[PDB]
Structure formats: structure tokens, C-alpha cells
Amino acid sequence: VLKKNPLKNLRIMLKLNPYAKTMRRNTILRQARNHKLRVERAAAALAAKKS
């Protein structure tokens, strides 16, 4: 068998450890969530600067 590297090859990671799927589903969403919230702070800071 060829060793596909788990850390690059998503489905190999999942084969060896299926809980990866969730862990990576979280920490896309989590990071997006927080990225949105940073824009919202930045918009409030611009509004406070305009005021």
C-alpha cells in the first residue's frame, strides 16, 4: 500500500480518524463566525469615528 499522507489527504485522515470531519467543520465555521464579528467591530469603529 502507498502511504497517502493523512494531513494533506482529507479522506485518509477520516479513514484513520473520522472525528476529524467535525473538528474541521468546526474551525471553518468558527473562523468565519469570528471573521464576520471582526468586520462588525470595524464597522462600529468607523461609525464611532464618523460620529
Binding site: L10, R11, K21, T22, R25, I28, L29
Partner: protein, 236 residues
Amino acid sequence: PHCSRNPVLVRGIGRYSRSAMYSRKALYKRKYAAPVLATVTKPVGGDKNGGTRVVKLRKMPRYYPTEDVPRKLLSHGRKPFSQHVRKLRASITPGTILIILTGRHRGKRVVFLKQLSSGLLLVTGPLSLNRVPLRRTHQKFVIATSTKIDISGVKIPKHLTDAYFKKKQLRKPRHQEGEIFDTEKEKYEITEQRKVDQKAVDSQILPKIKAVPQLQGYLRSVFALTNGVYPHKLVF
């Protein structure tokens, strides 16, 4: 035949879950309580005296070779070119300008029209200006200049596709041996449909290009590296 009830988050990661999907797809309520010899398989025909005759579709062969190669191993993810996904440098947008780097139309400047099915570019350096017709090119042998004409509302013919811009001639046998056979034929003739297509497309572009001052003259000119000017330093 509903579409995909979870969207894509990342290639290979759906947005939702197993559990959200069970509720979305609604596996609750969609529970499916469900608890040769004589007769010949696939031959059959007609015929006269004696009776009817049983033929055999796909009849076993009349020659076996002495040795032959033995299968392969399935191999997973190896699509034919047609089923491939097609890329495009973000630089190259419709109605942008290219510098065609390789062919006979070499260094000539051009307008980009569309990405065909193939993944090739369709191109025109309006035949009128440049002497570059409706023509295919590759992303990879083209420099996407940072200069655009607004080409939005020009109806490029639907019928012009990869399949049409495709070389034509030459079949197998004929006289063959001697000093003849398809060393002649000689010329790719332009044809009238091709000339009509060009005429139609160019007119829609040609006004649009002119609106930009000097642009026609730019599109006449040929690109070339002079002394002291290095590709890596300059921009296009």
C-alpha cells in the same frame, strides 16, 4: 430529483453534519417498511424448412492469440479530458487584451472573447486591425494585459465552439504509393461561414474598441522586448 440539501463548505466538507442532515432530509417519516437449461436466454430468429433456427448474438470467436495482456487495477480517479474541470487565470476576463506569445500570430495583440468547452481561449484581434481571425489559444501561451474593452453585450454566435474551430482533412487509403496522395490537397480554404462569423463578431467589437482612444493603434502593434526592459520589472 432535488439538489444537494447541504451546501459545500470546503471541497469534501459539507456545511451541515450527519445529524442536521437526518432532520433536513427527514429520515423520520421516510422509513421504508419492506419485508438456462431449456429456456434459452438471448438468441432467436426465423427460417424455412426443418423449422425455425436458434441463432446466437455475439458468437464465440474464430481466433485466439497465443498470448495476450491481462487486465489492470481499476484506479480510482483518472477522468478523460472531456470530464475535466477547466481553470482560467483571473487576469483573463472577457473583453480583456492578450499578447499571444507562441504561434504565427506571435507578439500580436488581441481581444479575448470566451473560454471554450475545451478550456482553450477563443480570441480575436479583429482580423481588420491585426490580421488575427476568430481563433483558439491557450491561457498558458498568452500574457493577460491589464487593458480591457467593455465587451459585455456582444452576442457571440452560439454555434461557434471548440468543435467548429477544429482541423479537418485526410483519410486513410487512396493510391498512396508513388509521388502523390495528400502531399497536395495544398490549401486550407477559408470557407464562407467562417468569413460570415468573423464579419458578425468584429462589427460588435470594432465599434467598442475604437471608443477607447489609440486602442486600435495599440492593437495594430506587435510586442517585443527591447534593450533595458525586463519582463519581470515591467507590468502587463
